Amino acid sequence: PWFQGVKTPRALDFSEYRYPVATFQPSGPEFSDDLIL
């Protein structure tokens, strides 16, 4: 039966690709100093 049928799987063609979010840029300052009234 299947001996006479040969065909590549249909889930092997690729198109338009894809893209996720990579990451977030780390950034933060610190410049506190404190006094009382």
């Binding site: 198109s15 894809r18 990451t23």
Partner: protein
């Protein structure tokens, strides 16, 4: 088999969590697993806990107690999934996050 509770993942490189005592809440162990597997805080809430031997999932505020005798195996899995998240399926609209004034 051996006495004790074990967390399990799907990556052989990450060693399983191991604990002998302590009185925990599911969110703490969840964000512990997240820290160990290095998941962004923007994405940790997609994950939860599940018991294969019970076919049930623990509550976010559920309390788990050890008594030097208890033992069970747990699975830190992602649960909330949305179909056609990708853009490969052109037959239906995909999904995306909102962006401040392309799609994220």
């Amino acid at each position: 088999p051996e006495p004790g509770v074990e967390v399990t993942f799907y990556l052989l490189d990450r060693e399983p969590l191991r604990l002998g005592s302590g009185e925990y809440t599911a969110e703490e162990l969840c964000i512990r697993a997240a820290q160990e597997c290095s998941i962004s805080p923007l994405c940790h809430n997609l994950f939860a806990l599940y018991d294969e031997s019970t076919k049930l999932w623990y509550a976010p505020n559920r309390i788990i107690t050890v008594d030097d005798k208890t033992s069970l195996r747990l699975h830190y899995r992602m649960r909330f999934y949305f179909t056609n998240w990708h853009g490969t399926n052109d037959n239906e609209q995909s999904v995306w996050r909102h962006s401040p004034k392309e799609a994220t």
